């Protein structure tokens, strides 16, 4: 099986400017304190690395492929108080639902 993650926060791609120059999705850039963000992968001294904001709710499910994972995550987001714009990344198998840019 493949395990998929649903995140109720933005994923960030960040590089060194202490202070990191981060983008979220198209690409909006902003500067963050390194304390506010959480690594989703190994941190890179040269290029960018994927990060998370400290405040995040996540859940997971096993599925034949992403199309079935979206069934369950849409259900989870209706049963709980979750809304937003959706996004899927196949490299990490992570869905993201965010209500940003409002």
């Amino acid at each position, epitope marked *: *099986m*493949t*395990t*998929f*993650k649903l995140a109720a926060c933005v994923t960030l791609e960040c590089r060194q400017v*202490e202070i990191k120059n981060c983008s979220f999705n198209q690409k909006v850039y902003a500067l963050f304190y*390194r*304390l*506010d*963000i*959480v*690594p989703l*992968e*190994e*941190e*890179r*001294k*040269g290029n960018s690395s994927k990060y998370r904001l*400290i405040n995040c709710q996540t859940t*997971t499910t096993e599925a034949v492929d992403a199309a079935t994972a979206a069934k369950v995550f849409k259900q989870y987001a209706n049963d709980n108080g979750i809304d937003g714009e959706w996004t899927y990344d196949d490299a*990490t*198998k992570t869905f993201t639902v965010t209500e940003g840019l409002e």
Partner: antibody
Amino acid sequence: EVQLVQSGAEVKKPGASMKISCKASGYTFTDYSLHWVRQTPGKGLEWMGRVDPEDGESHYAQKFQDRVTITADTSTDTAYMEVRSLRSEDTAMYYCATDHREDGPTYFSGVQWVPFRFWGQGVLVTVSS
Amino acid sequence: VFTQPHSVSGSPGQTVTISCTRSSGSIDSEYVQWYQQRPGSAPTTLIYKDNQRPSGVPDRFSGSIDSSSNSASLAISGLKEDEADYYCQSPDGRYNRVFGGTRLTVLG
């Protein structure tokens, strides 16, 4: 808490193969890739490859991309490394290892990502006639 | 390749520095980790992101970057139970990883 528990030592004939294994507990197995590292006796550490347990994605070093195959089972939370066409040179300690995140040493640092934070106990595989 | 001095030595109480020199590029282009392996045991993390100590690692161990030398270095003070192998590590791109190793010998 976090434990990587490896399989027992083996002996193999030249040309044969091995499928070594490594059970994980104490962390969400699908959050961190599991790596494999070899140590020829009297020689240093040498990274073999890795597997990302949430899918089948695996990666290997230039030396080992030919004979080695690393896999992960997320029903048992066990990672396996298979090595075909064994040779006298392959007599080594084989270690599984995994990265882990920590909240850093200071208030300012934040949540860090630490490579090879936990290691398995190692398995000595001898190749001999 | 990462090249380390296969042997380094130091007396009780003193401070000892172990080199880690990159042949292929700048040590400022990837983070350098360090590990300790006591005889007959699995490795343990001592440093990551050039100079950060993991949970439980004493202040006696410190990591360093000398961009002029293109050499990273691990400096261990208060030499002792510190007798072990010591290895540096750094990545190579999105997916690959490179280890250095140094046998740290405590004498006197």
